[PDB]
Amino acid sequence: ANIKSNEKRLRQNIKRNLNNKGQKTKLKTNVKNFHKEINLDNLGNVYSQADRLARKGIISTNRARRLKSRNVAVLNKTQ
């Protein structure tokens, strides 16, 4: 009543979830740091992490795009 393919897929996606959760938390903390101490330097890090996640497919590329756009809007408004 069980399939080796299904079991192996579960065992793989556990590790994949761990790694992807780590990356997403890193992105969250970087964007939070940017918003906390707004500075044009942190926007670059936000860009890098969002783009890397969007390529890897962990995050939706359109969400990465909207994050970039809204952070740039905040920066342009403040400067």
* Cβ proximity to RNA, 37 vs 57, nearer residue: 57
Residue 78 near RNA by CB under 7 A: no
Interface characters, 22-61, with RNA (x: CB under 7 A):
-x-------------------xx--xx--xx--xxxx-xx
How far CA 12 is from CA of 4, 5, 8, 9, 16, in Å, comes to 12, 11, 6, 5, 6
Residue 42 CB, nearest approach to RNA (Å): 10
